Amino acid sequence: QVRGLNKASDNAQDGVSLIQVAEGALSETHSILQRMNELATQAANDTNTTSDRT
Amino acid sequence: AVQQEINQLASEITRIASTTQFNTMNLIDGNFTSKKLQVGSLCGQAITIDISDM
């Protein structure tokens, strides 16, 4: 039980450390989507001509 | 001699009309209709800029 619970705890930390990579990678998916919303909001203005929306 | 100026001024009102631009779009030839501004954070929060031919 002790030896198993120690591998079990080390596996829950391999789980936390894995999650922190995904949770950190999506942290810049937010920075990219927050930027894509702000760009799309700028482009939705009919003062931009074609050369500005491209 | 009045007609010389009433023609040069009528040509001039049409020079204003085709020559005025913002960002390289004509503003007052009357092709500036249905041109929405986007004035908030969500899909389609418009104000519509409409100008008749001048």
Using an 8 Å CB-CB cutoff, list chain B residues near A52.
Answer: 23
SS3 assignment, position A30: helix
b/e per residue B13-43 (b: at least 16 CB within 10 A): eeeeeeeeeeeebebbbeebeebeebeeeee
Residue B33 per-residue DSSP state = -
B23: nearest CB among A41, A44, A47: A47
User: Residue B24 is nearest to which of A41, A46, A49, comparing CB atoms?
Assistant: A49
**What was the structure determination method?**
cryo-EM
Per DSSP bridges, beta strands B35-38 and B21-22 are unpaired
- Resolution of the determined structure in angstroms stands at 3.2
For B35, the 3-state DSSP assignment is strand
Are residues B23 and A49, on separate chains, in Cβ contact within 8 Å?
A: yes
